[model samples]
Target: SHMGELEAIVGLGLMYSQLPHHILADVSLKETEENKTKGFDYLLKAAEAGDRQSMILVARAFDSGQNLSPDRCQDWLEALHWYNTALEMTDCDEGGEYDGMQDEPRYMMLAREAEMLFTGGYGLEKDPQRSGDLYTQAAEAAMEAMKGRLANQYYQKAEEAWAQMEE
Candidate 1:
């Protein structure tokens, strides 16, 4: 029972937290705060449970607000640790796999990591070679996502973005 509950809880939180900032711009600040709090709380729970997908979202939750405070670097530093953990984790299959979620999400995570690696941001030092390889993989993953029919035009856009960066 708890095993099944974990998947939907974590997945819904991920969607809530990752909702584009602009989408809620027209809404009240209270709404934004509630979603953010709920999302971050659920994600943190699963992350602590060693769910790699939640690990990434927890990292992103840390990442999403690193620009608003004087203490921002520490914020991303927190993000970086989770990012590293997600990458180091290879046995990430606790949650049941969603058919259309196989590639694009992984690709997005890799691409975001590559961006940090490229710029030396969020406590990660610049590693052009490493970042380059990740970007390549991200692009290819996006292609794989397309092949898997998870190709939402969003992945197509991601593919194009990664291609431009690769060049």
Candidate 2:
């Protein structure tokens, strides 16, 4: 029961944090500062409770500074830490194939970290070698992802044609 509650909380918080205007599409959320703050608070709590999606959302909020106040928007260190934490929670390792439809977010996260490292942003020291490695990994994962999606699309179309012929 309580476990399900956390999921509900995460959904509500995500709506407030990322979909205020589209909360219900014409639902007309005010997008007030307080609501934004509430959104982060909700996600942060869920994240601390071991919700992977919430962890990523919290990391992104800090990374993009969307949920933070203007003064704290530059807190890249916090963002990096959260990103690292989210990465740690992933069971996927390097050299594995990724499905674009399913692993798109993971690919993006890897690319974002690579950018942060390469650019020396997030208070991280510049390490082109290490950054390059990450970029390579992200690229490989992306290619695999795209290939998976492309094949799936072709297969779906073939199935549809076969079904039409049978009818």
Candidate 3:
């Protein structure tokens, strides 16, 4: 029974990784007959133990109802919480531990631009008149990296946002 449980758990992980939603859904309904409960159980356990990828996967499964029931109202909130946790654990800015995540130069640039734009004290304190200037610089940096239709689309959105703020 223990061996069967282990096998079920491992098989579930593999299936979750490889199978598409529709197929997974069809098979999940057969889980009782197939005795594949271990995998889902194990993934939940791992996610609880703070395995980042497992957290991401479980969050996605709950949100999308791939092989699981959907909880529409809380799904996006839960997904965002797990993603934020993963981001915090990875510390994307320190020691290059999150180099894989930050490898997208645009993300790195955007982070720096956001920091500069939002850091200055306001009201009874110092104000950076240069906030608009930094937005312009960020817009230019994003535009320069445009390589495809999607990239151009994002750049245009940023340009539009900057223009709105600058006015």
Q: TM-score each candidate.
A: 0.49, 0.56, 0.39
User: What Cα-based lDDT does every candidate model obtain?
Assistant: 0.62, 0.63, 0.50
TM-score of 2: 0.56
List residue ranges in candidate 2 displaced over 4 A. 1-37, 92-104, 147-167
lDDT digits (tens) for residues 78-152 of candidate 1: 676787787667443234335654542666677788777767664567666666677666666656655343334
lDDT ranking, high to low: 2, 1, 3
Candidate 3 wrong stretches, greater than 4 Å:
1-38, 70-74, 95-155, 160-167
Ranking by TM-score: 2, 1, 3
Which stretches of candidate 1 lie above 4 Å from their native place? 1-45, 66-73, 87-98, 102-104, 147-167
Is 2 or 3 the stronger prediction by lDDT?
Answer: 2
**Reference-based TM-score, model 1:** 0.49
Best by lDDT: 2
- What does the lDDT come to for candidate 3? 0.50
Model 1 CA lDDT for position 140: 62
